[PDB]
Amino acid sequence: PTLAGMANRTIKAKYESYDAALSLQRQVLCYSKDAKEIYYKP
Amino acid sequence: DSLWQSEDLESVVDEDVQRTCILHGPVASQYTSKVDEPIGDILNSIHEGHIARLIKEEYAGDESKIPVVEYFGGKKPASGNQVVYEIDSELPNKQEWLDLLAGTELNWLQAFISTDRIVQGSKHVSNPLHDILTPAKHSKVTIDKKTKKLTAFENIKGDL
Amino acid sequence: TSKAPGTNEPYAIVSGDYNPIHVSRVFAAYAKLPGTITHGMYSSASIRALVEEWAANNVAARVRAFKCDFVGMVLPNDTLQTTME
Amino acid sequence: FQLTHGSIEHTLLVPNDLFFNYSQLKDEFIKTLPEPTEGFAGDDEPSSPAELYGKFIGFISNQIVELSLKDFESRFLDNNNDNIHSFAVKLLDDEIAKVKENIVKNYYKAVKSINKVESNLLYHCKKLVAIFGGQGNTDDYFEELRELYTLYQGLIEDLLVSIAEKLNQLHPSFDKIYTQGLNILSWLKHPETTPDQDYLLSVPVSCPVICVIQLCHYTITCKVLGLTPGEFRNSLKWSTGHSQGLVTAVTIAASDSWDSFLKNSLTAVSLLLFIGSRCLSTYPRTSLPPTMLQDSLDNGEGRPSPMLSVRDLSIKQVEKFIEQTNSHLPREKHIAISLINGARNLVLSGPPESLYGFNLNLRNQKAPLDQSRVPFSERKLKCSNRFLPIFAPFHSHLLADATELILDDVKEHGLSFEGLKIPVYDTFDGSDFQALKEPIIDRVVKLITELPVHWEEATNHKATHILDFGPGGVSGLGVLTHRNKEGTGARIILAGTLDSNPIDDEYGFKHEIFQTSADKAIKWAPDWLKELRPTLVKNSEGKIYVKTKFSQLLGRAPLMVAGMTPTTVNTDIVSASLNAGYHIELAGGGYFSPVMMTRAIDDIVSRIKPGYGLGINLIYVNPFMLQWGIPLIKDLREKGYPIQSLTIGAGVPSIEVATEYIEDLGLTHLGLKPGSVDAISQVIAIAKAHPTFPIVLQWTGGRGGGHHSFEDFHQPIIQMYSKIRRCSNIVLVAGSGFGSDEDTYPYLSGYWSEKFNYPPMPFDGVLFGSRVMTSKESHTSLAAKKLIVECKGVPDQQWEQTYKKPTGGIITVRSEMGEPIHKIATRGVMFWKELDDTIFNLPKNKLLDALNKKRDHIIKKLNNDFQKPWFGKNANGVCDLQEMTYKEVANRLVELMYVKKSHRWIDVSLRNMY
Ligand SMILES: Cc1cc2nc3c(=O)[nH]c(=O)nc-3n(C[C@H](O)[C@H](O)[C@H](O)COP(=O)(O)O)c2cc1C
């Protein structure tokens, strides 16, 4: 997850209050780690 | 054991203050400015300043308006001429009985009854009156006048 | 849980489906079905409300193909335990 | 007669034929009573003889009833005949609320017409103020009206019936949003018919019902005292209301004789019905995403609502957060200040989703944390925000478009409030509604829908007695405004519920309004400016003293010198400072055994005049000090020494330790200086355990001193003063950076709290620790005194940045035990700070390696900068202790342990070591 991490810290640094106010529940997922969430296999 | 050096500086290495540690308050250092003045003088200055503020504000600057008592003290924060009290055993509260005997005015007998301690040559021991005037059953007490005298009677050998 | 309405008149009025078996007692009795059963379309819409509420996030972009089959029958004032997975 | 059930009975003297009839009614009554429950802990089993009497009279209420009434009143209601509530709560305190309310109900069923002026201590001495609660005060509000209807049937059944007809007639007027109706009588009498709490809480329903609760409480307060509304209202100085209750306030101001009171109630109910219906129609609440409420719930939050209450934050901080959320939301789902219940209590209106995003932001910014070890200036802010039980965003732009519709609908029904007798404080602007060009209803509707509520400004009262008639009760408006007016002399009475009075007796209750004895009927909240005013007094000799709760006990000025291990261990400083006539506590820190402490005490006693008294200061951190000092203090007290006070330093003792210190050793008062909010709570608990023993606090903010339990000097004693003064024996003195009359008089007179917008908060005394160092009596060295004087000071706001640099020549250094000490930034103190920042903070393995690598440098620094030099040094050259001949070791010991100029050793033990 080279891009997932930097997208995470981008939304943290820039879109944290935006996500809070708009009630946007961003779910950053990477095929390497979060494959269960990708395939909906909890 | 770093605190005594500031008191005894004649012993530390070369009597240099910068080597010694002195405890002090940053907010009080502005007010602390004068060298070698009496502690009584400092506290007198503070008390007299407070008295000046109070006399100017709440008394129009007149000292005659200050309430006067014979003695100032002995009052716990959590608190006619011819009278006769017939003490019983039902429930005479010690505090209430002593207050009634002491009276309202801040006079010699008020002090001498309500005070809980007695001084014996600079020695604070228990007040003998809180023992003598303690509720018994027949310690009838009588004050002749507001500032004249007091007497306590008992039915000794069946005679008051 | 979804609860069928006390009466089928409001749904009949709004939807235009004036089938008497839902509102009139006499027609249901004649039809031999058990009482003024609620509209199957009311049931579908009421449970698709549950889908739009829980499966989505009140988001209208998620409203898409919704198949439904009225396998059984529902009476008025009936409490129905919906289940979706 | 033998009316009894279990081990309780009541005797009634009945006439003969009346006795036969009473026997008939008695066997009929026991035919209905339940069996004893072996404790009367059941439901219908009476738990008192008069509870049984009430059950009996209530049974008859379905010639003998008058006899039972009169006998009950004579036996139990001693002059409190109209005050059955007082009896009910007397049972609650001495002899639960269900049976108390049941006896109240039975009595009120039994009474004839109650048109008799009750002597409620002149109805609380003729300033009487009537506040009405609003929406969101409580979640299960409807049970309040349930109990009200069930138990006060004879008084407000007519009103409830009138409201039911009024609302069922109001629905045809425009329209019914009411999926389950609004027939309140059917809901009340049939519990099954009532819908769920969500539908009850829906605003078009709930607003009429909250009006019902308020009007019912007002009607009860009238009928019980036998006061017509036209004259009860006259008894009130003024009246107002919260977000919703203001309409009831203006209506009560418009009250009149009972026939006109019913019309007034019609007006208020119709207005609230229109407000609720129009507001819901304009902004109907929608489904709420379950994932969103689940996220809210699993972070210690309630169900989202259109109003979000935030506490422990200022309007400015809360406003900045709303501006962030609004900037990132569109205008139509914005958040706006709905109402300002106080300085640290706010509620914000808007969509539930917008307020959920708001709460996400607030949770991100807030902290859970045990910050006691963190400086106050850099401490994260705490807050407890939650959504109120409401289903409408009142006081927001969302309902602004409902306004014009509400007024247009009002104009059709002739609704108009013009003849207001008492003032009605404007809920937003604060002024009286009487002096308004626009219609009163127009202004009030615009208030409830659009404008915010500055609650404190609205209730800027000048009065002594306030009573809340709204919903919530303990959770209602009265308790909320009591916090805002704790110390201003305002007594809040919750005239909407009967319950056991507060364990601290802070706000009144229905029992308190209805009491008749003028000891519990007349209750005034503490007015700190008046009851703790710094007074003056004069002695027979003419000396002027400052009479306070602290000076009164000591008999001398309320200006003490606190205990000091370096500064207040000398015999002379204590003796002469005492002879000046000011209390000083000799510190034990310079004394390491009872023999030294006894010698110092004996020297001071010999050097002070007769009739005098000193104190002692003991540190609680070291158990050795306590175990050798407490027995010594007890011994000296049993001898009769002038020891007057024991000041326990950093660390308030346990309850058992305070108990034995208060009883075993006979001190006049116990100095119990805390250093935190929790420590103040421990001191308060100790004072409660000993309500009669004086306990001087000596609370220090940690801004100045030596060992400072770093806090702010203002905030802890701002939020604990109220809880401190609910204790007859706690004496409040505080130091921490006082050195002059200019900076101590505001604290003495209580004006220091005006800047914080709290009531005046007078202090009994003040302690001066750092100002008395330069005093001639102190034996601190003259060079040390010069350094103390030449080091400048620091205003209060800038004290707390002393951890980083020498603020005014003083810095904070870590102790051997880790406690911070304020020390003047000498070269030695700066070396201490460097070491406890760079070396002592490292782990053990890193400590030793760093110790060597920087030992090469520390040996020099100790030689040139610190009290303790490197012992290994010889004539200048750095050497280790191993690089040392016996001759030069002995020479160094002479040089460093024996004073040449004074021709003596520093200490006999050092001489023995040599
Ligand atoms: C040199 C010094 C020593 C102190 N020693 C003690 C002590 O041993 N025990 C204690 O409880 N407080 C001690 N204190 C705290 C003082 O009792 C008092 O709270 C403090 O000096 C108030 O500071 P301020 O006058 O600058 O506002 C000490 C203070 C100083 C300045």
Curated annotation (Swiss-Prot), chain A:
UniProt superkingdom: Eukaryota
Job of this protein: Fatty acid synthetase catalyzes the formation of long-chain fatty acids from acetyl-CoA, malonyl-CoA and NADPH. The alpha subunit contains domains for: acyl carrier protein, 3-oxoacyl-[acyl-carrier-protein] reductase, and 3-oxoacyl-[acyl-carrier-protein] synthase.
Assembly description: [Alpha(6)beta(6)] hexamers of two multifunctional subunits (alpha and beta).
Family, similarity comment: Belongs to the thiolase-like superfamily. Fungal fatty acid synthetase subunit alpha family.
The protein, known as: Fatty acid synthase subunit alpha
Organism field: Candida albicans
Span covered, complete protein: 51 to 92 of 1885
UniProtKB/Swiss-Prot annotation, chain B:
Domain of life: Eukaryota
Subunit and partners: [Alpha(6)beta(6)] hexamers of two multifunctional subunits (alpha and beta).
Function, as annotated: Fatty acid synthetase catalyzes the formation of long-chain fatty acids from acetyl-CoA, malonyl-CoA and NADPH. The beta subunit contains domains for: [acyl-carrier-protein] acetyltransferase and malonyltransferase, S-acyl fatty acid synthase thioesterase, enoyl-[acyl-carrier-protein] reductase, and 3-hydroxypalmitoyl-[acyl-carrier-protein] dehydratase.
Family the UniProt entry places it in: Belongs to the fungal fatty acid synthetase subunit beta family.
Protein name: Fatty acid synthase subunit beta
Source organism of the structure: Candida albicans
Residues of the full protein shown: 1020 to 1189 of 2037
From Swiss-Prot, chain D:
Region of interest: Acetyltransferase: 1-433
Region of interest (Enoyl reductase), ranges: 445-778
Active site: S243 (for acetyltransferase activity)
Signal peptide: none
Family affiliation: Belongs to the fungal fatty acid synthetase subunit beta family.
Function noted in UniProt: Fatty acid synthetase catalyzes the formation of long-chain fatty acids from acetyl-CoA, malonyl-CoA and NADPH. The beta subunit contains domains for: [acyl-carrier-protein] acetyltransferase and malonyltransferase, S-acyl fatty acid synthase thioesterase, enoyl-[acyl-carrier-protein] reductase, and 3-hydroxypalmitoyl-[acyl-carrier-protein] dehydratase.
Oligomer and partners: [Alpha(6)beta(6)] hexamers of two multifunctional subunits (alpha and beta).
Protein name: Fatty acid synthase subunit beta
Species of origin: Candida albicans (Yeast)
